[PDB]
Amino acid sequence: PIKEYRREGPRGPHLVGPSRCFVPCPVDTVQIVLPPHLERIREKLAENIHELWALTRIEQGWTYGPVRDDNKRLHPCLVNFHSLPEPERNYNLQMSGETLKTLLALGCHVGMADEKAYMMSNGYKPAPLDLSHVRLTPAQTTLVDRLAENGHNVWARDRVAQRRNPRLVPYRLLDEATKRSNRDSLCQAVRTLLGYGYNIEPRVRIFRAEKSYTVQSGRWYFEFEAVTTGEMRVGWARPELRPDVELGADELAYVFNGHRGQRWHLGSEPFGRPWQSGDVVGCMIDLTENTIIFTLNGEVLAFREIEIGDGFLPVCSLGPGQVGHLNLGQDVSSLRFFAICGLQEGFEPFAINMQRPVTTWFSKSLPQFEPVPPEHPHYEVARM
Amino acid sequence: LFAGTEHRAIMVDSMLHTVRGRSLTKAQRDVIEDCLMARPSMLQHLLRRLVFDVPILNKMPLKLLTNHYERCWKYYCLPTGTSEEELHLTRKLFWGIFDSLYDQELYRMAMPCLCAIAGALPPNFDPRPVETLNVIIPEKLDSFINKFAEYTHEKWAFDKIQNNWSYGENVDEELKTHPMLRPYKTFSEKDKEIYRWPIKESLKAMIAWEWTIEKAREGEYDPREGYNPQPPDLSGVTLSRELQAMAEQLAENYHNTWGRKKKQELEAKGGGTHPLLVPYDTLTAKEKARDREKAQELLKFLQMNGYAVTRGYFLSTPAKVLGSGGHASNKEKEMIFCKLAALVRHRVSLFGTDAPLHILARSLDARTVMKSGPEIVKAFFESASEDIEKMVENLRLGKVSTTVALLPVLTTLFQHIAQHQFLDDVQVSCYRTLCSIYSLGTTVEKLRPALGECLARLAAAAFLEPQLNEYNACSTLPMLCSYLPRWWERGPEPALPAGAPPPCTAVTSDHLNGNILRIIVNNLGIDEATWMKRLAVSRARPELLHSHFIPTIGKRAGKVVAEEEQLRLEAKAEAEEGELLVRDECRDLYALYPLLIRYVDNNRAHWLPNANAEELFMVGEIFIYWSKSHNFKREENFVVQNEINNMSFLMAKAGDAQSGGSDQTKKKRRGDRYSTLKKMLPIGLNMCAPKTRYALKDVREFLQNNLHLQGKVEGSPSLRWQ
């Protein structure tokens, strides 16, 4: 149902929004240089890469011969790397030089940090070394995935002359099973370089309960289940708040953030825990004892010694993709969050007060005209 | 804000005059308090001119003003966590202060707070122009100087064309014409030198400083009357930060060449002084720009002609490398004055941990080198305890993010075997090693296995200090062979042996990451062991920390004994409460028992099963009353005073919350709609303001349960004093 700000769920109406929304455009790599002293490493890496490619084919049952046919398992490139002319050899050479050029593009310190250093097959079974013996750094693996992304996007750029093939999509958006090949060759080049000892160093929805329903007296408590982890921020805030300002960035708001736990009251203030998905926030505003206690599935963790300037309102705010189930009363809908720390402290669910479902408001992304107030960031008008 | 900066620079000038004694010191206290009172950024601009003054600070009075200003930079450090680079220069000045060697050490502590400001960054004048005329420029540049001087004519003319100036034989500023406005080709070479002179003197300054100037890359509003320049876009040329530094220092040359002459210009005359006769670092970039635009545009034209141009946050990490050199300098001191400055730097080392990628391991290697310079002292002296505090910070150094350092741990582990023959300060490093291990709990291996040889020396043997280290060091078929025997140790329930065995339970708790239920039984056994052991000294309090780890290892059936233990603590308390009543016509020992119950609250935290407690509707409510009965003893009075004695050697509401549920299961939901018996139970609380007589005013299912809320209301009355 397009964009949306709500969708129904088994526990109740989960809140959503604002969602998120291209054609491939790979960065140039050919302009990058991989100079002579490293060009020898280009030749060696091309040799070991062509060898590992030969293993990748032979494992599939490929066998050398004049024919290039796939079903017959016959292929010209299964001959010696030296024997291959720099075209047929370029398939494992130019890809390697472009690999290192892309490594330079990544800002890697891919110099000569270290000196460079089995089933029978039909006329060609060379062996190099045990490349897998050395563990890759995770950063190097992510960089390898960047190599797969850049090389595949470039392959799409070359294939752009030929609506569109399913393979002709950006690497970020294509299915992960398609990744499991370019990532494999990337792991091959990575185990080759590391095996040679080459180091590589590299619009927010707000939900407000209705102003008529604003609390101003007594103790109160609402809940917010969260279908998905992320930039959640749930708390109490004064009715006169302006939505255009990010929530929690001002004195008017008192909210606890989703990830990191950095609850806000005008600026950052870390506390609590980064809860896992499905955990209940369950905010507990307290008047007389002017504080706002917070919980995580009945696990108490906040803001203290406030004042009632015009009462308070039940407030929530979602991230770009985050989704959660705001909760407001109905003892049947009450679960782990209220059965424990709720009644014992005497705090009241809103449907104790009410029968009608509580309507709220939210800030549409849509710009609209609005008369300029005399107080503002002083874009002052002057009739004359 | 600029007026405030001016007044601040003026008061700073007064402090420089002070750098009438005590009164002027009061004026320095005035500038100090003024700095403390305060936009903060413009205040930091006045503190930027005062940062240049800080460069002038290193004099003792100036050091004191710099110290109070450093405290202002500590308040700035609080507020903040461009000018940050100047703060880095102030850090270099602090290292210079380290090179300078009482109160000065405290000033260095202020420079340690300034070092914390650097960590936030990581998150009369005496001009000395270099001689120029003595230096001889190579003559290959003359073709360039022709083009750039002709360009100077082009700019000086184009600026005139902006006001429509033109050639005219008579001088007149109002006629919009001037005689000098004639083509540069018409000028004699000597007249061309009028334009070339600042240029050639500038290049002579570049050669006197031996800055590179060599051939390389290739180099090439209505129209008005008279000569009509349309000057090449030198301003669009982009200098790098190095080239920006070079242009900034040529602007410094114009600030010195003219700056030295301007002094003498007013010396021979007997005249006063000029505003520009101030240190270059003090200058605002705009005052610098008057010469900088002349300086950059020269380098931009050199780059336009392709001449090579060189002098011929991340820095804070490089500053740590300088500290590593100081760590090497400390090793020179370790060979045994200069060491005392390093002892002064130890305070900064404590600040360095509060300050907090792969390069940081080199600093951790320096922290390992710091251990090398400390280990000799292990085998004034309070600095070693500060180094022991740094040893706590050494764990933070590992938390911040070679192989020989791991070998050093095997050496210190060997020292534990020497202890078996029969010092403690060397064992304090093991407490730091435990802190290093607690840091490792968040995250070669044979060197870690070398510690098992120490563990063999640990199990074989005041000794609690070394034993506590094992609890953190614990972070396995080999361990499994003795792990089953640990259950046999639980069957022991000789008090001294418990202190070491308790760490072994924590060791299994660290290994707990089903199988935990067996460890839970080991924990329940520890609960069954501590339950009797606490009925009897201070060593149990050491177990209370391990009991917290045992709580992390954690069983509702075990609570049935814990309730009986809490009741036994309460039934004994009934005599202890009577012990005070007996004296009406001591309890300090009970505070130690309360500390045992403080562990029970940590065990209650393991039960916080409190989630499961709502589903019970069990006997816990009666057990909570025992704690509530203890609360009555806490506000009878003497037991609360007894806790202060326990506090010298150094909650209940969570239990009370479950007690409130006694008013109810499904009936409790009806109480929400009552805005069922919870409402009537509240009426009983009104009667608590004034035992069975209150219940009669309203029954075993009610009057008994009401007594719990009534006693809790009495505890609430105890909380009413707050």
UniProtKB/Swiss-Prot annotation, chain A:
PTM annotation, UniProt: The N-terminus is blocked.
Note: Binding of [3H]ryanodine indicates that the heterozygous channel is activated by Ca(2+) concentrations 4-fold lower than normal. Single-cell analysis of cotransfected cells shows a significantly increased resting cytoplasmic Ca(2+) level and a significantly reduced luminal Ca(2+) level.
Gene for this chain: RYR1
Coiled-coil positions: none
Disulfide topology: none
Protein name: Ryanodine receptor 1
UniProt remark on domains: The calcium release channel activity resides in the C-terminal region while the remaining part of the protein constitutes the 'foot' structure spanning the junctional gap between the sarcoplasmic reticulum (SR) and the T-tubule. Pore opening is mediated via the cytoplasmic calcium-binding domains that mediate a small rotation of the channel-forming transmembrane regions that then leads to channel opening.
Known function: Cytosolic calcium-activated calcium channel that mediates the release of Ca(2+) from the sarcoplasmic reticulum into the cytosol and thereby plays a key role in triggering muscle contraction following depolarization of T-tubules. Repeated very high-level exercise increases the open probability of the channel and leads to Ca(2+) leaking into the cytoplasm. Can also mediate the release of Ca(2+) from intracellular stores in neurons, and may thereby promote prolonged Ca(2+) signaling in the brain. Required for normal embryonic development of muscle fibers and skeletal muscle.
Entry's family note: Belongs to the ryanodine receptor (TC 1.A.3.1) family. RYR1 subfamily.
Sequence repeats: 18-117, 118-202
